[PDB]
Symmetry: C6
Subunit: 190 residues, 6 copies
């Protein structure tokens, strides 16, 4: 029993001109949908999501796991890291444990294993892989060439990665959690 | 005879202003069709389809055959695997079953011919190619090399070429059922 | 005679509501042309047309000749193949008729001789050249490299082209009708 | 004194929706220009124009000179060739004039100079450079080595090219009118 | 009396639909800006401007210092040249001054020097960096081989760079204004 | 209470025809948003901002840090430097401090740290890395090779790199302030 509720129902039909303009709005949504078709926030697949807000430090290439959510909260940003083939290797000639000319080449592989990119994002350090990728590869490469010998090096370039395999596992892991294989293509000088 | 039946039909030819405004809809639909031209769900014909829901369980590297059915329901997503060349190979030099050292290496090949890729999508492993490629290859050359290869070190790539396939054929089909050829370019050190 | 004929001519000289909206159509028509500008059916560049309908059967990767026609029948699809440079060759080491080290390397060329991609499409087998490219160049080589000799290989890597040129033309045409050139760029080991 | 001329100007002050909807046309003109922004007929930069009709063969891979004209006649199509660097060369070992084995390598150069792409369009044949590149290069190379000797070619890979410079001018003359430079990088076997 | 002021007040009120339809014009202006978002005439920081009109000789391979101006005069066209990295060099041996084999390989670098690309543009001719690269290098590179000897070249590929370094400065200025560096990376045959 | 504050409420609304046309405005804003979806000023990801006004070509190869501010005023422009791999190295073989032939190679690397690109953008030079790269790498290379001898250089390509590390650190930081490592792969000639 209330006239206020029954009166509101008369406002719906009252002024049908507003309903006509409502159509023009529907056509505008179809045109705006195109601009959205090119971008989106919900992680599609084969990729992980990461969070950051305008005011603050931006993320830095990092992917965790999939989830159903949209960037429609209030202060979240869209920036995610995608995985792909990684070509990065060099032949370094150096000797400090057997005179003559010794060589030692090393390379690391990046694999999307487990999930911990949001915690490693700022903990990984400045930049992303381009920073530590070359350092961890040239660092262990310059330290092992001095410990290893040239005689055993010429015997087999794969035998050199055997001792470095234990030093690289603790290095790449100290920055983040990932599974990489230790192997290298090296040429020795004589 | 129901008279209301004629009153409803008369509404088709005699519609309200919606008939005049309906024109703006036909002209707006042509614009929305453009956004669809850039993306769709029905597989064209030279590619196979795969299924997944917003929930966890994304799929990839999968493709069965062609049919007109796709992204029709609500719990379905568009993510399919397209065929493409695959460059992945290495020469592993190891010494164990010989006098000095033998070099044995093998490459794996994956070809989605016809065996339902969705069943293998979760079984094979989401993008687990980089994992099984080296894991299986790096493991095979490690087992066969220790089996026997003293004088065979030279004839190896020639004769062992078949032996590496015998153990690789069961390993390649282990992760999934597919018809593909596998051969590697070997070089021995002596 | 007939008054209905004179009443139909009055439809032109009039300014009803359809005329005010009729213009909105001429404008949106130019916007729909954009979606078509990105894709069409009438073959344009030096490419041939092929046909297939939404069904288990399909027709992709195949071109016959040019014709003036639009995909506006009732059940035809747009999927055509294009021609372009083709880089595909490998160095394989395999010797037995003489020594245990012989490297051979042949390259294949693609030429749209005449037109027969629609009949050769389903007759070519799954995929397109990717399957017959390596399967043929690798089989004709492993089979011929076994009969030839290593001592003659160093005499002239092209001398072997004369032999494979006869067996290659037999397998190359087995899939369809095309004119290919036989030549081999290779260095042998000894 | 004509009254009809006064009735024409009297019609100006009487355009209700004509003057209103007239604006919708001006705004639509800017929209149609967008689809044209991606493609056009008036050649631009250093490119030449070519002409062909749907039911009149097809022109392509051919550029003449610049001119101010639009493809708005009645039966003309937009398809033009562009200039760009050209990398194409091979090392072939062929010995016949002598008892030893001499090598002969050669490559052809292309230049947009001169204006004869429309006349050469149908003269060049169906294919374009891919057919004349390996043909004239593989033809003269095998036809010259047979005449030239090995001891004379080994003396200087440039000396043997001095004779081909005379025949290359005649063969290259076929592909429209253009001047080519005769020079080659070759290594001989012995 | 001052009718010019009374008519200015009557021009404001253009009917009720005049101000209502004027809005459709503003909404159309924002649309025309989209097609422009993809192109523009004011050279952005990092590029030089060039001028030409639909008449004869279309400019394109040029660049003038930055300036604030738009292609809105009356007869100007938008076509400008961009600067970037450039890899261009050859490796080949040549014999002439000595019976042995003299090899020479030099590479030229492009500097972002404004100076005046349009003045020299028409004086440069089409195919600048393309034909002028080998014409200046390939000529002084393959021609100087007959001037110097091989015994002195094999001693140091950089030694001969001291002489050609003086000729490379006269040829580089002969075409447009640019600063070239004197260096030679080359291997020689004995 | 005042009549101005009360009459203002009646001036806000403009009849049903005014509020009805206001809808067309909200629709135009949806279209202008798409043009912005392709470009913007607020930097994103791990990129830094740079500032310049319409006048010439400066402030381009630079990047400081992230903050929400960009192209707000009218004399500001959007042009920023994005970090990326850098391939630049050479082997310089020259003998002067000894009798035999000694080689000396060196490379310089540049990496952004924090607050340094906006100040050095002009002093460093608009993208002058191509000039300063060889200028310093070729300078310190000829000054050190002529200073030290080949006996100590051939002993290890790393030893000579340690002495140049002090001369390069002062030259690299000279053009700007940045933290980067400089190492080169050298090869000596016997």
């Amino acid at each position: 029993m209330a006239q206020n509720l029954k009166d509101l129902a008369g406002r719906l039909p009252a002024g049908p001109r507003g309903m006509g303009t409502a159509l023009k709005l529907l056509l505008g949504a179809g045109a705006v949908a195109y601009g959205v078709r090119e971008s989106v926030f919900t992680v599609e697949g084969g990729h992980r999501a990461i969070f950051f807000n305008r005011i603050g430090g931006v993320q830095q290439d990092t992917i965790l796991a999939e989830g159903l959510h949209f960037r429609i909260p209030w202060f979240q940003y869209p920036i995610i890291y995608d995985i792909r083939a990684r070509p990065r290797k060099i032949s370094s000639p150096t000797g400090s444990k057997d005179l003559q000319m010794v060589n030692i080449s090393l390379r690391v592989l990046s694999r999307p294993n487990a999930q911990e990119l949001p915690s490693m994002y700022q903990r990984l350090g400045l930049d992303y892989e381009e920073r530590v990728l070359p350092s961890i590869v040239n660092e262990v490469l310059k330290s092992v060439v001095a410990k290893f010998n040239a005689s055993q090096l010429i015997t087999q370039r794969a035998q050199v990665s055997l001792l470095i395999r234990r030093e690289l596992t603790e290095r790449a892991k100290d920055f983040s959690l990932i599974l990489d294989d230790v192997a290298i293509t090296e040429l020795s000088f004589s």
